[PDB]
Amino acid sequence: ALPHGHMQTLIFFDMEATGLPSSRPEVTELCLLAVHRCALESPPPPTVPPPPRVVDKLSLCVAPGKACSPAASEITGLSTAVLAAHGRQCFDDNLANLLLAFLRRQPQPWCLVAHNGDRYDFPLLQAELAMLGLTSALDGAFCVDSITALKALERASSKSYSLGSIYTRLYGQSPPDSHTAEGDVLALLSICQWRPQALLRWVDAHARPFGTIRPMYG
Amino acid sequence: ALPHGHMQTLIFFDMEATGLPSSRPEVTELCLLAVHRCALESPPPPTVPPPPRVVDKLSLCVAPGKACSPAASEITGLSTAVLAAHGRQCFDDNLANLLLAFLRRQPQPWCLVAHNGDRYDFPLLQAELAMLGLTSALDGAFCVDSITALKALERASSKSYSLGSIYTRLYGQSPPDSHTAEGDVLALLSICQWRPQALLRWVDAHARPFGTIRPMYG
Ligand SMILES: O=C(c1cc(F)cc(F)c1)N(Cc1cccnc1)Cc1cccc(Cl)c1Cl
Ligand SMILES: O=C(c1cc(F)cc(F)c1)N(Cc1cccnc1)Cc1cccc(Cl)c1Cl
Ligand SMILES: [Mg+2]
């Protein structure tokens, strides 16, 4: 049984932050890539599938309220000072409104899809919203963690489940860009396009209300 | 003299539409790529410059109120029916609000930069806004047509001024993607990064209020 019916839009989602959850981190970058279910349900001979022609994309850099750790800066190529030099603004009401306006362009139900999203992206997004007193602003959404999905799908078909490990295993080659939120979204999209009908079936069967994600902090 | 001071953000801009201006066309896709002036003023040995690490990007497909022409569909890879199949919504108030929220994340003054923007992108954007009764919604912005800029800059340094012609001339090779609004924005960004300090100087000297752009129709 499908708990919430068929998801109409999959929003591939990735954020960068100042550090890992135990550091009480803040967002430095976010990317949403909204794909209608038809792109996976009814896909139109390369090694890696091309992305769908019709997609919506939002990629934003954000000025966090604290320094990025050296480790974060090495992996993301961002620092708080450099974000500031590019005039980036903090995570504020306008940003929350922009996110909601972007989601409102997508048919519902919406499902956020993020790799280790239950550990990283989903609780951090909830924390940033809570700090604005906008708890529940995005609770119309559903979400799934792609690491859970891809573990289940690999088990059904037949090691590390990092994004890069899965990508290399499936496509016999490393992904293009590992250093930006957009790059991580595009790599995830490619993985999900490997067996797209199976992935979509799994998402529909296991989608969870975003409101069930507790904020990382606050 | 700088008529409006130094532009702080260059928003590389491209739209796709149902047809050329004489057909009274409607938007099918838009892409904004916001780059702080420092990326051009103070750039950090490849053939083509890499894009700046810190950018904001918005790419949206739009359901137009009429069919795309065969010619438009061949060049853009979009059709009205396919946009509809992907659940795309029309150019509406929510979209205008999303655009403004995105621009509000950028330091002012803002300058839209589009290739043949005076013929295509700028008057069409003004027309879509006018149809919503949102004339002047974006008139905080400035704009420049990159074909005018690049003609001036090539003359100062020393044929077709299509995006592809310029790109091939500068980089000795064709651009990656010619079929999406994002692809056209990224190609334009690359051209503008060829002599970035000169391009930025020209933009600052010649930026025009967006309110001086008459709507394409209506
Ligand atoms: O940017 C984040 C991040 C951290 C969060 F808590 C919440 C969030 F939304 C993103 N990273 C974690 C991560 C790891 C794997 C896949 N996706 C993200 C990257 C990262 C890696 C290694 C060391 C560091 Cl210090 C950092 Cl920041
Ligand atoms: O999509 C548009 C377009 C048309 C407009 F009026 C307003 C607008 F914002 C975009 N095209 C014009 C164009 C040409 C060169 C560079 N940039 C855009 C593409 C195009 C080419 C050839 C035949 C057709 Cl029928 C079409 Cl639609
Ligand atoms: Mg991630």
Ligand SMILES: [Mg+2]
């Ligand atoms: Mg164009």
